[PDB]
Each structure stands twice: as structure tokens, then as C-alpha cells.
Design a protein around this ligand. Structure first.
Ligand code: CLA
Ligand code: CLA
Ligand code: CLA
Ligand code: CLA
Ligand code: CLA
Ligand code: CLA
Ligand SMILES: CCCCCCCCCCCC(=O)OC\C(C#C[C@@]12O[C@]1(C)C[C@@H](O)CC2(C)C)=C/C=C/C(C)=C/C=C/C=C(C)/C=C/C=C(\C)C=C=C1C(C)(C)C[C@H](OC(C)=O)C[C@@]1(C)O
Ligand SMILES: CCCCCC(=O)OC\C(C=C=C1C(C)(C)C[C@H](OC(C)=O)C[C@@]1(C)O)=C/C=C/C(C)=C/C=C/C=C(C)/C=C/C=C(\C)C(=O)C[C@@]12O[C@]1(C)C[C@@H](O)CC2(C)C
Ligand SMILES: CC(=O)O[C@H]1CC(C)(C)C(=C=C/C(C)=C/C=C/C(C)=C/C=C/C=C(C)/C=C/C=C(\C)C(=O)C[C@@]23O[C@]2(C)C[C@@H](O)CC3(C)C)[C@](C)(O)C1
Ligand SMILES: CC(=O)O[C@H]1CC(C)(C)C(=C=C/C(C)=C/C=C/C(C)=C/C=C/C=C(C)/C=C/C=C(\C)C(=O)C[C@@]23O[C@]2(C)C[C@@H](O)CC3(C)C)[C@](C)(O)C1
Lengths: 193, 177, 73, 187, 171, 193
């Protein structure tokens, strides 16, 4: 929709639309829906990436065996960057297959978020109603109805918190990767990042 | 002009022997008060640090940067000598956090102190626990005046420490080092 | 296309183009025949320049190659 | 009616006020001979190719290079990619797009009465919008990129050097960088 | 003054500083100044170009042992002229301008000689173009060639004061 | 406007126009406005130049390090004459780039000073209103509103002072450079200039 009636705003940039380059004023509404969807997907991906990178940096691994002959701690014996290359290619292909199925089924839904849908509102069951494919009714977001006890005001406040945490998480994961690739850039990463 | 800051020890009147007002507008006086308050608060933090570290103080227990060979007690007791012994990563972290905080302070107050607003009221970084959340408007002005006076005294304090470090035997109570 | 650092080669081709353009003739119309520039722009347009520069390039190529075979360029 | 660009030449009658990018600049009266939508097709194709070419040339020269590609400058990148044998593979997307889009579009520009304009491929996936201000920005950037790529190639062939493509770097761009003592000696 | 001679080319009437729109009665003096400058500039440009490949035979003084073929091309050629030759050149120019080709009447500043045209010296034994289109073309050609010669003579002078020749480097 | 209604005049040259070459009455008003703008820019540049040349000749360098490995005092070890060349190339690039941006922005403003503007009235925010470019609202002239407590007559008097000081500063900076280039030209300027 219009960039004016959106949920970013925030008190950090005073309480108005932050946009200093005028990107949202030069483009139409459809591009703003695409920008919000990309921002929210980026924030969620970056939140998961930041948590996983911190877990890998703390050398925390599952008790067990990743592949037969390959312990979780054997992969996690180095930093998080040199752990993705230690995972077997089959496991990474299965992870990317599940991610591909999720992305495809998310975008295949009706009222596309440009053509009527809400940008960033991924519906609960992306694999429902598809002919030739069956899945359990585990929801994608909130398999447990945590956000069913909340009211509208609490949902709006937590959506704002999600947007702020997403922006912070993008900054954080880019800092982690840049600190590993170019040491001494981010001073907050001691050695194991 | 009228503002805050004045009180006793001057006669209830504004102190400026060299003029430095009557060439100042509301915007310029707001800048004067914002610079005075920032300098005041930084100087109070600076005296509270140098006085605690140099005189006594248990110092922070721990190590300070597990990889490089530095210890909290290995920094020393001098002010300027221990600052150089702080690692470059720590110095850059301190300066970057301060710069981010002030850039957000400039871009976060929408009535800007140079365009309205109140000088010295920066967002965040004040009472997170709300100690002054119930104070009366009359009492808050007294606390602001006390902040201004203590800050000016602390400005003189930091410059006394700097003078004693650089040119010896200046500030006669302060020793030669 | 331009010669390899030769200023004499440039003068022959430019002079040939100018001479051909001034000494053209389409339908009895010509700059040399006393027929004005503006209406030759009007009657022919870019066809005038294209034909003149084509024939001038042919004439200049012949003259340049002849003077190269004899000796000069 | 004089032209806006050339104040002493008459205005070309085929460029009235529409077709964003119209500065009234058409000597040679090429709009009378070449059809105007065909010329816009050619101009915008050249503009887009030159924009992508400028960005690719500068990006390869600055050091960005994908894995397994030859780590050479953009001047020798063509010969290196041909020697590696993969630069022929770029033709297939180019052949696909150019045949199956340009050939029917060129034929419909020449033949069909109602047809899309020159750069109007109706691509617009995100939905930024093809406003009249955006078309002017596109064509201004395209003319700039055409002249820019011409200059970049001609200077990079002469110098065989780094990104500024001058004989002495950015110091040729900024004469105050180079020995202001001689300038001060006459003051 | 926009319809007068010299306002013919691509610029039309080109007066950025507006000398003749501030003082439209001062155009005739400016035209005479421009015409003298142009004529001297055409002579100077022609001398610069012709002295490079053409030189007089024999000596110049037969007393300082100086030849015509020994003067190099330019400023140094005017240096090597004997003082009597310089005096005779200045006498020729002074007699040529004070009495024969007189561009100015008037006591000190010089307006224009009577109701003549600016730069309408010589008189009688000079070609007087009839057919006013031809006269206008000839006069505009004179003025424009004068301006181009001013710029060219200035450029060759700039070249000669920092080199030994008026030819720019790379040519 | 006309040279008659202009703030140059001054009391030193008899209270009238000094012009002995007749330049002001030989050109149109547009040329006079360009000359006033050029004189004001020259005067301000010369004031900055005279103060900087005096500071550099007194060897008053900044405390610290100009570039990592290059001290301010290392550059200012010689006179101001051999000082701009000792600056690192990147610093000169940044200085001249900021000057380029300032000149382009101040010239690309609404009513140009030759087409309806005031010659010498530089816009307070030259980098405001440019699409796709965001800058803080620091004013170019008076970031601190010093000339907000001044009336119109005080502003006119200080404009006259500015003009006279700019003329004196042009003479002074040319005096400094000539005194270095031609020793003994200016009697006061002894050696270190
Ligand atoms: C790629 C991620 C991404 C995307 C798509 C968006 C998209 C959006 N943001 Mg957002 N934002 C992001 C990251 C992103 N943001 C981050 C990381 C921060 C923290 C600094 C913010 C902080 C922020 C604020 C404070 C606000 C927005 C707002 C907006 C909306 C309107 C602004 C607009 O049109 O810009 C469209 C944006 C783009 C087209 C992205 C262009 C990015 C360029 C190409 C790269 C530049 C990156 C630069 C080099 C820095 C990289 C280093 C970095 C690690 C520091 C729009 C939906 C406003 C809003 O929601 O109002 C309703 C608002 O007030 N954002
Ligand atoms: C961007 C996301 C991301 C990526 C690419 C990785 C990548 C990796 N992780 Mg990792 N991780 C992540 C996020 C991520 N992590 C998060 C958010 C957590 C905190 C829960 C962890 C916790 C974690 C541990 C404890 C271990 C890894 C390990 C690994 C490596 C092997 C792959 C593997 O076993 O995956 C495992 C990945 C996960 C378990 C994360 C699942 C992420 C989903 C989306 C969350 C599901 C929601 C829900 C809370 C999960 C429980 C539900 C269930 C109780 C019903 C690999 C480098 C292992 C390692 O060190 O190398 C062998 C290992 O032992 N990860
Ligand atoms: C051996 C190759 C092969 C064969 C025989 C088929 C056959 C079929 N495809 Mg198909 N497909 C293939 C490869 C193949 N596909 C590939 C590689 C792709 C790309 C990923 C697709 C993508 C595709 C789409 C997108 C669609 C089809 C559909 C169909 C069905 C058309 C009408 C129909 O019965 O609908 C009625 C549908 C059914 C009767 C579904 C029953 C099919 C189940 C899955 C059989 C179970 C097989 C079992 C798991 C063993 C397979 C092992 C294997 C996974 C290793 C037909 C059965 C259409 C359809 O309706 O099917 C869903 C449809 O929409 N296919
Ligand atoms: C004004 C400059 C100039 C000069 C110096 C030359 C000089 C020359 N031209 Mg040439 N030429 C010129 C202009 C000039 N041309 C122009 C304007 C054109 C038109 C484009 C040509 C087209 C031309 C052609 C096509 C040929 C020459 C050839 C020649 C050379 C031999 C001619 C000869 O002996 O006739 C030959 C003697 C004959 C008796 C001709 C017999 C004819 C029968 C029917 C065959 C000679 C060096 C010839 C050449 O290069 O040979 C080495 C040649 O083939 N010229
Ligand atoms: C005018 C546009 C243009 C042109 C002509 C080039 C030309 C070149 N670039 Mg380049 N570049 C450009 C724009 C351009 N660039 C831009 C805009 C960017 C910035 C985004 C770059 C960034 C860039 C980098 C980073 C690199 C180059 C490189 C190269 C060189 C080798 C390219 C190559 O081998 O392609 C090979 C093409 C392919 C491998 C893809 C072909 C597609 C295959 C055949 C499949 C076809 C599709 C199929 C039909 C459908 C899908 C099938 C499948 C999915 C199942 C070559 C000189 C490389 C080089 O060698 O530099 C030294 C290099 O590293 N460029
Ligand atoms: C290049 C700088 C510059 C420029 C553009 C101007 C422009 C102007 N001055 Mg000015 N002035 C300057 C330098 C300059 N001045 C200096 C350095 C002094 C101090 C001596 C003065 C002192 C001065 C006075 C006292 C007055 C003016 C006035 C004027 C205005 C009307 C005169 C006019 O039309 O002349 C147009 C001027 C030019 C086109 C500039 C010509 C520059 C020539 C080519 C340089 C010749 C200098 C020569 C080499 C000698 C230098 C030696 C010196 C360093 C000692 C005009 C806006 C009058 C005014 O404001 O009345 C309203 C007035 O009364 N000026
Ligand atoms: C068995 C369990 C089964 C499942 C049970 C339920 C599970 C719950 C569940 O999964 O929900 C997950 C969930 C939820 C939920 C709820 O629904 C619940 C459960 C109930 C419901 O009412 C409410 C909600 C909320 C809807 C939220 C998740 C949020 C996340 C992950 C946010 C992630 C956010 C990462 C960031 C910000 C990264 C930041 C990185 C930074 C800052 C990096 C950095 C640095 C440092 C290095 C630090 C320091 C450096 O310093 C210098 C140099 O200056 C600066 C910088 C930038 O370099
Ligand atoms: C008896 C004495 C007669 C004296 C008068 C006279 O002789 O006039 C003769 C005359 C016409 C006439 C006649 C009348 C005058 C009308 C009347 C006469 O009858 C009588 C006696 O009444 C006869 C007649 C019909 O003939 C016309 C003379 C015209 C003349 C002599 C015109 C010079 C242009 C030079 C230019 C444009 C240079 C540009 C220079 C340029 C553009 C440059 O930039 C130079 C350049 O170098 C630079 C800087 C760098 C180099 O890398 C490149 C070059 C080289 C390009
Ligand atoms: C609701 C709302 O308001 O949202 C909130 C979200 C959120 C996150 C809470 C907010 C915040 C606060 C934070 C923490 C903001 C953090 C911002 C941060 C930390 C921004 C780092 C930048 C680092 C850079 C650009 C590195 C450059 C690096 C550069 C330029 C290089 O050196 C590159 C280069 O060396 C190479 C690689 C080689 C050659 O090429 C040469 C050069 C030299 C060019 C905000 C802002 O308050 C807004
Ligand atoms: C009204 C208003 O607002 O304006 C204000 C502005 C302002 C500036 C403050 C005013 C002023 C007053 C001031 C300070 C004026 C300053 C004047 C100053 C200081 C002027 C230095 C000249 C040095 C020269 C000429 C050097 C010559 C040097 C020459 C000519 C040579 O080359 C020497 C030589 O050639 C000979 C001579 C013969 C040859 O054989 C040999 C050589 C080649 C070697 C005003 C006008 O009062 C009021």
C-alpha cells in the first residue's frame, strides 16, 4: 500500500518515514509492497542467521551424529563459517529443497502480496489446497497458537518489535560475515566468528 | 538570555564579561546550552573515572580481551598511559558507540534544539529505571541547576587533570604525575 | 575510420569529399551550378550528404592509393 | 520555428513535444528518413547495452570476479573468456531475448499500425512505474552511458591501466593535485 | 544595433557584457577599433605563416652583417632588426595611421571621421562595392575574418612567448 | 542591479565609486552582477587564504596525525608555500570534491544571481531539495544563527565591512605569495612565508 500507512516508522528515526533517498516517493505502491515483503523476509532470515551464527560461535552442537561417521561436534570443531563446508552436500541439498518448497508454496498463494495480499503476512498453511501434494496442518508461523491470546494492539506492537529486530539482525549478520572475511573490521568478534 | 543556569555566586544575573551574547539568537543560545550540557556531562564522567582509577578503586575484575595479553590491572594507574594501553579494537568500539549514539540523538529528536525543542534533552541513555519519573516540575529545575553547576566544576576538574599531566606542578594539589 | 597518424592522408580524403560535394549534380541541381544550399537541403536531405561522402570516399581512396603507389603518404 | 538545441537550425518537424528525451536536437534530419519508433528502439537498445557494459567494465576492473573466472582486467577479459571457452554460452540468453522479442517487435514496429513504442517491452516486474519523468531519466542515463562506454574503451585501450583510464590516474582529473608550486610561482 | 554588420553568424547579436546595449551610441567607435584590430591581425597571421616557408634574399642591413634568412621565425626576428630599421618601421606605421589612413577625427579621444562609416579610411583609390548584398557580404567577411585573425594571432603570440615557434607542440 | 545602488562605495575613496577605468558604466547590469558575485567569492576565498597562510607561516599545526604515518607538523615543517604539495593525494581529492559539490549545488539553485537572485547571497542549505541526496540541515553560512540578532542596518554595515575586508584580504594574500616568490618585494614579510 502507501508508504505513509505502514508499520515501520519507529521512534529511533523520530517518528516519521526514515527514507532519505526518496525511494518510496519515486516508485508506485506495488514496489512498496515488494520492498516491505523483502524487508520482512530479510529480517526473519537475518534473525535466524544471527541466532545460528551465535550458537555456532559458542561451539554449541547437538548430542549425536550428523551423518554416519560425522559427529555434530566434528563439524562444529571450527567456526561457523567453516562448518557449512563440513556439512555433507546431501544435507545442504535437503535443506535447500525444503526452503525451495516453502518459498514456492508461499508465493503460489492467491491474492499475491502485490495483487491484494498483505506484504509480509505469510499465511499459516502454504502446502494446503495443492493437488497431488499432501502435508499435515502444522502451521508455518505459530504451529502453536501463541498469537491467538494477543489483541490487535499487542499484535501491532509486536509487529513493530519484529521490524526493529529484523533491521538489527541484518546489521548483525552482515557484521558477523564481514568480520570473518575481513578480520579487524568488526572489533566485537574475538576469534571464533 | 534568561534561561536556566544562573543562581547564586553571581548575584542572580547572567555571567559573561566578554560579551558572547547579544550576537546570539534563540538558535545560538540553544546551541550554547547544548554544548555546555554535553561538555558538562562528559566532564563529570571524566572526573568520576580519572579520580576513581588514579586514586584507589578495586578496578574491574576480569581480563579485558582474552587474546591479546592485556589485563585490567596491567593498564596502570595513570590516566593517559592506561588509555594508550587500551587495545585499538576497544578504542574503536568506544568511539563508534559514541558516534552512533550522537548521530541517533541528532536524527531522533524531531523538534531539534536548533529548530525548537529543549537543548540537552537527548533521547535514551537517561533513567531506564525512572528515578525521576515522579519529580515535581519545581524540583526538576533545581536538579537541572545542580547538574549545570556540578558540570562546570567538573569541566574545571578535567582541565586541571590534563594540565597536571602535561605541564608538571600546575594545579598544586595534584602531584607531579 | 582514420589513418595511422598521417595528416596528409586526412587532407586528401577531406578535400576529395568537399570537392565531390561541391561538384555533385542531382537532377541538374548543384552547388557549383549556382543552386542554393537551403533548397538542396530541402529537396534531398541526408541523401545529398550520404551520396556526396560515398563518392568522395571512393575518389579519396583512389587518390590516396595512387599517391601511395607513386610516393608521398 | 527554430530548434531548442540548435538555435540557428530550424526545428525538425517530426519531434513536436512527446517521446521523452526530446531536446529538439536532430541535425541531418534523420527523423524524416528513419522511422521514429525504429530509431527509438535502436537508441534504447544501445542505451541499455551501454549501461550494462559500463557497469560490467568498471566492476571487473575494480576487482569483483565470480569463481573460476580468469582474474584479469576488463581489457583482456574478452580474450581470457574466449580462451576459457565459456563466453559463447552468453549468446544463448542473448539469442533467446533478441530473436524472440526484438525480431517480432521490429517487424510489428515496421508493419503493425497499433504497436508498443521503442523501449516499451512492458517488462516492469516490481511495478516501479513507467512515468514520463522516469523515461527522461532512463534516456538521459542511456545517452550518458553510451558516451561513457565509448570514452572508457578508447582510453583503456590507450593506457592499458587502472580505473581512472588517464595517463596519470585521478591526478589528471584534478590539476591542483599536480605541483601547485608552478602555479604559485606566477602569483 | 542588432541589425548591423557582424551579427550574421550562428550567435546572431553576441554581446554578453552588453557594451553596445548600455551605450548604443558607442558602437561606431567599437566597430572602428575592431576593424583596425582585425586588419592588423590578418596581416600578422599572414606574416607568421608566410615567414616559415618564404624568406627574402640578401642582407637586412649590410652593416650589422645580418641576413634575411638568418632571422629565425618570430619574436627573435624582430629582436635582431637593427635600431634604424625599427625606427623606420615605427615611422612608416605612424605616417600610415596619423595622416594617410586616419581612423579618428577629434582632439583627444577620436570619434569617427565625419559622417563616414567606421573604418572607412583610404578613400577614392579603393574598390567600392555596389550591389548592397555583395557589399554586405564583403564587409561581413572582412569583419569575421578579422575576428578569426585576432584569435589566431593571439594564439601564435602565446605560442611564441613560451616556445621558439608559433606552432603548438604535437603539430 | 545598477552600480549606483550597490553596497561597495566606501568612505576611503571620497564616498563615491572608485572605478577609474570606467568599467561599471561600460557594461550592462548583468555583467555588474557577475562582477559583484566574483568580487564577493574572491574576497571570502582571500580572507580564508590570508588566515590560513598566516597560521601555516607561524608553524601552528594541528595536534595529531594527518594521515596514518603523516603528521600535521611533518607537512607544516616548511612554509605555507611548500605545504599543499605535502598533503596526501586523497586529502586533496576530498577537499576539492567538497568544493566541487558546494559550487555545483550553490550554482544550481532557484533564481540564479544573474537571473533574479542576489549576487553574493549564497543559499543557507545548498544540499537541500536535491532528489536522491540527503544532507543534514547544517547551514553553509551561519550554522549558528549569529545573524539572527542583527537588524537590517547592522547587516548592511557588516556587509560593507565584509566587502572592505575581502578587498584587503585579496591584497594581503597576493602580498604573501609575492613576498615568497620575489624576496624583498614586501618589506614586512621577512623569511618564513
Ligand atoms: C534490503 C533490506 C531492506 C529493505 C527492502 C527495506 C525496505 C524498507 N524500509 Mg528498511 N531498513 C533496513 C533494510 C531494509 N529496508 C535496515 C537494515 C535498516 C536499519 C538501518 C532499515 C531501517 C528502516 C527505517 C528506520 C525505516 C525503513 C523503512 C522502509 C520502507 C520504506 C523505505 C524504502 O522505500 O526503502 C526501500 C529500500 C530499498 C530499496 C533497499 C535499498 C538498499 C540499497 C540498494 C543498498 C544500500 C545499503 C548500504 C550500502 C548499507 C549496507 C551496510 C549496512 C550493513 C549498514 C521499505 C519497505 C521506513 C518504513 O518502514 O516506513 C514505513 C522507515 O521508517 N527501514
Ligand atoms: C539461517 C539459519 C541457520 C543456518 C543456515 C544454520 C546452519 C547450521 N547449523 Mg544451525 N541453528 C540456527 C540457524 C541456522 N543454522 C538456529 C536459529 C539455531 C537455534 C535453535 C541453531 C542451532 C543449531 C545447533 C544446536 C546445531 C546447528 C548446526 C548447524 C550446522 C549443520 C546443519 C544442522 O544440523 O542444522 C540444524 C539447524 C537447526 C536445528 C535450526 C533449525 C531452524 C528452524 C527454522 C527453527 C525451527 C523452529 C523450532 C524452534 C525448532 C524446534 C521445533 C521442535 C522442537 C518441534 C549448519 C552450519 C549443528 C552444528 O554445529 O553443526 C553440525 C548443531 O549441532 N544449529
Ligand atoms: C516420470 C516422470 C513423470 C511422470 C510419469 C509424470 C506424470 C504426471 N504428472 Mg508430472 N512432473 C514430473 C515428472 C513426471 N510426471 C517432473 C519432473 C515435474 C517437475 C517437478 C512434474 C511436474 C508436474 C506438475 C506441476 C503437475 C504434474 C502432473 C502430472 C500428472 C498429470 C495428470 C494427472 O494424473 O493428474 C492427477 C494427479 C495425480 C493422479 C497425482 C498422483 C501422482 C503421485 C505423486 C504418484 C506417487 C509416486 C510415488 C511417490 C513414487 C515416485 C517416486 C519418485 C518421487 C522418486 C501425471 C500423473 C499434474 C498433476 O495433476 O499431478 C499432481 C500437475 O499439476 N507433474
Ligand atoms: C589524382 C590522383 C591519382 C593518382 C596519382 C593516381 C595514380 C594511379 N592510379 Mg588512380 N585513381 C584516381 C586518382 C589517382 N590515380 C581516382 C580519383 C580514381 C577513381 C576512384 C582512381 C582509380 C584507379 C583505379 C581503379 C586504378 C588506378 C591505378 C592507378 C595507377 C596506375 C594507372 C595507370 O598506369 O593506368 C593503367 C593504364 C592503362 C592503359 C589502363 C588500361 C585499362 C584497361 C581497359 C584495363 C597510378 C599509380 C591502377 C592501379 O592501382 O594499378 C596498380 C588501377 O587499377 N586508379
Ligand atoms: C553489456 C553487457 C556485458 C557484457 C558483454 C559482459 C561481458 C563479460 N563479463 Mg560482465 N558484467 C556485466 C555486463 C556485461 N559483461 C554487468 C552489468 C555486471 C555487473 C552485474 C558484470 C559482472 C561481471 C563479473 C563479476 C564477471 C563478468 C565477466 C565477463 C566476461 C565473461 C562472461 C562470460 O563468460 O559469460 C558466461 C555466461 C554464462 C556462464 C551464463 C550463460 C547461461 C547458460 C549458458 C545457460 C543459458 C540459460 C538457459 C537457456 C536456461 C537455463 C538453463 C538451466 C538453468 C537449466 C565478459 C568479458 C567475468 C570475467 O571473466 O571477467 C574477468 C566475471 O568474473 N562480468
Ligand atoms: C577580481 C576581483 C574583483 C572584482 C571582480 C571586483 C569587482 C568590483 N569592484 Mg572591486 N576591488 C578589488 C577586486 C575586485 N573588484 C580589489 C582587490 C580592491 C582593492 C584595491 C577593490 C576595490 C574596489 C573599490 C574601492 C570599489 C570597487 C568596486 C567594484 C565594483 C564596480 C567596479 C567594476 O565594475 O569593475 C569590474 C571589475 C572587474 C571586471 C575586475 C577586473 C580585474 C582586472 C583584470 C585586474 C587588474 C588588476 C591589476 C593587475 C593590478 C593589481 C595590483 C593590485 C594587486 C595592487 C565591481 C563589482 C566599486 C564599487 O563597489 O562600487 C559600487 C568601488 O568603489 N572595488
Ligand atoms: C522445544 C521448543 C519448541 C518451540 C517452543 C516455542 C519456540 C519459540 C519461538 O521459536 O519463537 C521465536 C520468537 C517468537 C515469538 C513469540 O511467539 C512467542 C514465542 C509468544 C508470542 O506471544 C510473542 C512472540 C514474540 C510473537 C521470536 C524470535 C526472535 C528472534 C530469533 C530474534 C533474533 C534477533 C537477532 C538479532 C536482533 C541479532 C542481533 C545481532 C547483533 C546485534 C550483532 C551484533 C553486534 C555485537 C557483536 C553484538 C556487538 C557489536 O558492538 C559494537 C562493535 O559496537 C555491534 C554488533 C552489531 O556488531
Ligand atoms: C595595396 C595594399 C592592399 C592591402 C589590402 C590587402 O592586401 O587585402 C587583400 C584582401 C582583399 C582585398 C582587396 C581589398 C583590400 C578589398 C582592396 C584591394 O585593392 C585596393 C588597393 O583597393 C585589393 C583586394 C580586392 O584584394 C584580403 C586579405 C585578407 C587576409 C590577409 C586575410 C587573413 C586572414 C587570416 C586569418 C583568418 C588567420 C586565422 C588564424 C587562425 C584561425 C588560427 O587559429 C591560426 C592557427 O595558428 C594557430 C593559432 C595554431 C595552428 O596550429 C593552426 C592555425 C595555423 C590554424
Ligand atoms: C524502527 C527504526 O527506526 O529502525 C531502526 C533499526 C535499528 C537497527 C534499531 C537502528 C539502529 C541502530 C544501529 C545499530 C545502526 C547501525 C548502523 C551501522 C553499524 C552501520 C555500519 C555501517 C558500516 C559500513 C557502511 C561499512 C563500510 C565499509 C567501507 C565503506 C569500506 O571500508 C569498504 C572498502 O574497504 C573496502 C571493502 C575495499 C575498497 O572497496 C575500499 C573501501 C575503503 C571503500 C536504527 C538506525 O535506529 C533504525
Ligand atoms: C572603498 C572600499 O571599500 O575599498 C577599500 C578596500 C581596501 C583594499 C582596504 C583599500 C585600501 C587600501 C590599501 C591597503 C591599498 C593597498 C595597496 C597596495 C599594498 C598596493 C601594492 C602595490 C604593489 C605594486 C603595484 C607592485 C608593483 C611592482 C612593480 C611595478 C614592479 O614589478 C617593479 C618594477 O617595475 C618597476 C617599477 C620598473 C621595472 O623596470 C623593474 C621592475 C619590473 C622590477 C581602500 C581602497 O582604501 C578601501
Amino acid at each position: 500500500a502507501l508508504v505513509d500507512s505502514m508499520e515501520g516508522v519507529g521512534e529511533e528515526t523520530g517518528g516519521q518515514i526514515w527514507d532519505p533517498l526518496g525511494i518510496s516517493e519515486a516508485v508506485s505502491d506495488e514496489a512498496v509492497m515488494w520492498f516491505r515483503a523483502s524487508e520482512l523476509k530479510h529480517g526473519r532470515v537475518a534473525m535466524l542467521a544471527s541466532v545460528g551464527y551465535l550458537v555456532g560461535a559458542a561451539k554449541i552442537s547437538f548430542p549425536g551424529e550428523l551423518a554416519k561417521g560425522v559427529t555434530f561436534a566434528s563439524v562444529a570443531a571450527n567456526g561457523p563459517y567453516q562448518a557449512w563446508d563440513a556439512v555433507p552436500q546431501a544435507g545442504k541439498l535437503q535443506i535447500l529443497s525444503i526452503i525451495l518448497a516453502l518459498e514456492w508454496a508461499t508465493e503460489a498463494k492467491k491474492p499475491h502480496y502485490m495483487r491484494g495480499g498483505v506484504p509480509g503476512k505469510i499465511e499459516q498453511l502454504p502446502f494446503d489446497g495443492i493437488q497431488g501434494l499432501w502435508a499435515p496442518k502444522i502451521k508455518f508461523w505459530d504451529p502453536l497458537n501463541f498469537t491467538g491470546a494477543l489483541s490487535a494492539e499487542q499484535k501491532a506492537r509486536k509487529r513493530k518489535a519484529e521490524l526493529k529486530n529484523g533491521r538489527l539482525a541484518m546489521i548483525g549478520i552482515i557484521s558477523f560475515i564481514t568480520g570473518h572475511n575481513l578480520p579487524g573490521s568488526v572489533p566485537a568478534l574475538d576469534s571464533s566468528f | 538570555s534568561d534561561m536556566e543556569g544562573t543562581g547564586p555566586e553571581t548575584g542572580g544575573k547572567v555571567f559573561d564579561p566578554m560579551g558572547l551574547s547579544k550576537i546570539a539568537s534563540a538558535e545560538t543560545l540553544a546551541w550554547y546550552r547544548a554544548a555546555e550540557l554535553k561538555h558538562s556531562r562528559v566532564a563529570m564522567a571524566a572526573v568520576t573515572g580519572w579520580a576513581w582509577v588514579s586514586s584507589g578503586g578495586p578496578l574491574f575484575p576480569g581480563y579485558l580481551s582474552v587474546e591479546q595479553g592485556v589485563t585490567f590491572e596491567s593498564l596502570g594507574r595513570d590516566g593517559y598511559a592506561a588509555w594508550a594501553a587500551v587495545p585499538e579494537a576497544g578504542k574503536f568500539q568506544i568511539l563508534g558507540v559514541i558516534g552512533i549514539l550522537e548521530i541517533l540523538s541528532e536524527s531522533a529528536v524531531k523538534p531539534h534544539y536548533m529548530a525548537g525543542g529543549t537543548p540537552g534533552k537527548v533521547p535514551l541513555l537517561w533513567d531506564p529505571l525512572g528515578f525521576t519519573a515522579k519529580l515535581s516540575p519545581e524540583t526538576l529545575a533545581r536538579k537541572r541547576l545542580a547538574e549545570l553547576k556540578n558540570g562546570r566544576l567538573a569541566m574545571i576538574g578535567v582541565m586541571s587533570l590534563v594540565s597536571a599531566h602535561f605541564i608538571p606542578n600546575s594545579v598544586p594539589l595534584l602531584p607531579g604525575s | 575510420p582514420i589513418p595511422q597518424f598521417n595528416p596528409a592522408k586526412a587532407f586528401i580524403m577531406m578535400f576529395s569529399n568537399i570537392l565531390i560535394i561541391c561538384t555533385m549534380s542531382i537532377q541538374g541541381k548543384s552547388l557549383a551550378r549556382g543552386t542554393p544550399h537551403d533548397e538542396m537541403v530541402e529537396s534531398f536531405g541526408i541523401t545529398w550528404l550520404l551520396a556526396g561522402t560515398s563518392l568522395g570516399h571512393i575518389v579519396g581512396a583512389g587518390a590516396i592509393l595512387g599517391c601511395t603507389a607513386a610516393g608521398f603518404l | 520555428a527554430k530548434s531548442k538545441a540548435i538555435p540557428f537550425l530550424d526545428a525538425p518537424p517530426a519531434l513536436d513535444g512527446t517521446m521523452a528525451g526530446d531536446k529538439g536536437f536532430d541535425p541531418l534530419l534523420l527523423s524524416n528518413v528513419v522511422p521514429i519508433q525504429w530509431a527509438r528502439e535502436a537508441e534504447l537498445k544501445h542505451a541499455r547495452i551501454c549501461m550494462l557494459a559500463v557497469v560490467g567494465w568498471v566492476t571487473v576492473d575494480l576487482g569483483f570476479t565470480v569463481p573460476y573466472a580468469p582474474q584479469v582486467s576488463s581489457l583482456a577479459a574478452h580474450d581470457a573468456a574466449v580462451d576459457k571457452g565459456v563466453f559463447l554460452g552468453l549468446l544463448i540468453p542473448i539469442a533467446l531475448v533478441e530473436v524472440l522479442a526484438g525480431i517480432p517487435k521490429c517487424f510489428q514496429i515496421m508493419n503493425e499500425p497499433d504497436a508498443s513504442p521503442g523501449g516499451d517491452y512492458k517488462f516492469d516486474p516490481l511495478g516501479i512505474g513507467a512515468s514520463a519523468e522516469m523515461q527522461e531519466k532512463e534516456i538521459s542515463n542511456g545517452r550518458l552511458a553510451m558516451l561513457a562506454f565509448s570514452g572508457i574503451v578508447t582510453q583503456a585501450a590507450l593506457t592499458q591501466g587502472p580505473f581512472p583510464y588517464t595517463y596519470n590516474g585521478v591526478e589528471d582529473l584534478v590539476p591542483p593535485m599536480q605541483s601547485v608550486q608552478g602555479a604559485l610561482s606566477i602569483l | 544595433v542588432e541589425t548591423e554588420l557582424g551579427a550574421t553568424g550562428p550567435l546572431g547579436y553576441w554581446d554578453p557584457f552588453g557594451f553596445s546595449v548600455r551605450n548604443p551610441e558607442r558602437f561606431n567607435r567599437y566597430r572602428a577599433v575592431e576593424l583596425k584590430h582585425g586588419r592588423i591581425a590578418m596581416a600578422a597571421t599572414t606574416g607568421y605563416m608566410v615567414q616559415s616557408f618564404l624568406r627574402w634574399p640578401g642582407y637586412l642591413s649590410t652593416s650589422a652583417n645580418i641576413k634575411f634568412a638568418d632571422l629565425p621565425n618570430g619574436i627573435a626576428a624582430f629582436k635582431a632588426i637593427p635600431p634604424a630599421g625599427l625606427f623606420q618601421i615605427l615611422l612608416f606605421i605612424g605616417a600610415m595611421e596619423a595622416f594617410t589612413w586616419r581612423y579618428y577625427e577629434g582632439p583627444w579621444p577620436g570619434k569617427v571621421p565625419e559622417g563616414k562609416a567606421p573604418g572607412d579610411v583610404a578613400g577614392d583609390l579603393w574598390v567600392r562595392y555596389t550591389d548592397p548584398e555583395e557589399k554586405a557580404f564583403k564587409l561581413n567577411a572582412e569583419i569575421n575574418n578579422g575576428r578569426a585573425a585576432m584569435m589566431g594571432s593571439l594564439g601564435m603570440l602565446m605560442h611564441d612567448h613560451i616556445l621558439g615557434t608559433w606552432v603548438p607542440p604535437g603539430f
